């Protein structure tokens, strides 16, 4: 397993614009599109992503190259930040993973402001970190998906995804 197998099965693969779980426009292997409440709004985002005229719709191939960018976004804005990189650094292989998830999700500033599971993450206190990570609305709001990560953090192992 891997960084990209494990967001492929949390986010799914969808070539037609679609809402996600908080309502937003989004394509692909998880990628946000916009906030805005306009499908057309989401429709200029995606051409303009795409280099095309796509009308809604893009291919296989167009939609794992926005995921490839992606997930070297988040890992460099992982690097690239004086909180996350410390974590991130402290981190073994698998764990490392699950924080890229996070970033991948919920973007490297909501991440950033778990400043006390991160501590314990840094500290190498797994169960109570886990027990941290759960007190948030993104427990609350994607349950299965968290419990998946925070089983990753608790364990160091791939184990929820298999
Ligand atoms: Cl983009
Ligand atoms: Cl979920």
Same mark, same amino acid.
């Given at each position: 397993?891997?960084?990209?197998?494990?967001?492929? %099965?949390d986010?799914?693969?969808?070539?037609?614009?679609?809402?996600?779980t908080?309502?937003?426009?989004?394509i692909? %292997?998880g990628?946000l599109?916009?906030?805005?409440?306009? !499908?057309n709004? &989401?429709?200029?985002?995606?051409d303009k &992503?795409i280099?095309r005229? +796509?009308?809604?719709?893009?291919?296989?191939?167009?939609?794992?190259? !926005?995921? @490839? /960018?992606?997930?070297?976004?988040?890992?460099?804005?992982?690097?690239? @930040?004086?909180?996350?990189?410390?974590?991130?650094d402290?981190?073994?292989?698998?764990?490392?993973?699950?924080? %890229?998830?996070?970033?991948?999700?919920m973007?490297?500033?909501?991440?950033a402001?778990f400043?006390?599971?991160?501590?314990? !993450?840094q500290?190498?206190?797994?169960?109570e &970190?886990?027990?941290?990570?759960?007190?948030?609305r993104?427990?609350? /709001? +994607?349950? @299965?998906?968290?419990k998946?990560v %925070?089983?990753?953090?608790? +364990?160091?192992?791939?184990?929820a995804?298999?």
């Amino acid at each position: 397993m891997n960084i990209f197998e494990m967001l492929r %099965i949390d986010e799914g693969l969808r070539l037609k614009i679609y809402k996600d779980t908080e309502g937003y426009y989004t394509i692909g %292997i998880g990628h946000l599109l916009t906030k805005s409440p306009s !499908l057309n709004a &989401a429709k200029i985002e995606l051409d303009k &992503a795409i280099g095309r005229n +796509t009308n809604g719709v893009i291919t296989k191939d167009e939609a794992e190259k !926005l995921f @490839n /960018q992606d997930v070297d976004a988040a890992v460099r804005g992982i690097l690239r @930040n004086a909180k996350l990189k410390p974590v991130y650094d402290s981190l073994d292989a698998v764990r490392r993973a699950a924080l %890229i998830n996070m970033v991948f999700q919920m973007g490297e500033t909501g991440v950033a402001g778990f400043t006390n599971s991160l501590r314990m !993450l840094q500290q190498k206190r797994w169960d109570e &970190a886990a027990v941290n990570l759960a007190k948030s609305r993104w427990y609350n /709001q +994607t349950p @299965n998906r968290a419990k998946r990560v %925070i089983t990753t953090f608790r +364990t160091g192992t791939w184990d929820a995804y298999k």
